Amino acid sequence: DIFDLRDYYSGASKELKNVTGYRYSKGGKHYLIFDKHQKFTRIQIFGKDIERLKTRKNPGLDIFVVKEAENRNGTVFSYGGVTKKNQGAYYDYLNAPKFVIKKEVDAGVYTHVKRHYIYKEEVSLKELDFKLRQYLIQNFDLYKKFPKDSKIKVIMKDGGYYTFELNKKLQPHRMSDVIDGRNIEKMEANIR
């Protein structure tokens, strides 16, 4: 339902920094597990990230967590969103691509130009998708109308791009994909 899609992207998320993930696999699924305050978080890993993490112990990770499920032990489950922590040390954002939002209005389309500040060298598609939708829900009335063919496009300096179709959740198998934050040129959204 459209309201479940909205409530997903309006919900809580957290960025965990410099954590050590332990790799394993069960039933043909691949995971990274970590612990904090005597509690576990299990992250499912997808795509070719499955062998970028090919060692048991993986220090120095950043994880973007969106709770998908939680059990009685309080173990939280989330999909993808694992990146390497920054090698640099920064005092402000490292890139500020324009976010060009074309919003349908009465009798036309109105283009708003915003910035989206990037603080990470390696950024997951999961994090960008989630944060950009949440911003559009809060500020540009995303999901107050049915989204139809609405999309977000992230365009890289070399001309490569990534597309987020707004009529459904980001596909789980894409939630491990990572891009270089320094190389994003611009982002576009067309909103109903």
Ligand SMILES: CC(=O)N[C@@H]1[C@@H](O[C@@H]2O[C@@H](C)[C@@H](O)[C@@H](O)[C@@H]2O)[C@H](O[C@@H]2O[C@H](CO)[C@H](O)[C@H](O[C@]3(C(=O)O)C[C@H](O)[C@@H](NC(C)=O)[C@H]([C@H](O)[C@H](O)CO)O3)[C@H]2O)[C@@H](CO)O[C@H]1O
């Ligand atoms: C069943 C399923 O979940 N399949 C996933 C693919 O999605 C399915 O097929 C596509 C063609 C659409 O019909 C989807 O609705 C459908 O679920 C998924 O394919 C990717 O889908 C997205 C849109 O959802 C998009 O079309 C992808 O194409 C690009 C893009 O615009 O994002 C094309 C770009 O040139 C390419 N960029 C670069 C630099 O290569 C990107 C990039 O590869 C991906 O964005 C990375 O995630 O893709 C289309 O590939 C497929 C791969 O993401 O995952 C399937 O599990």
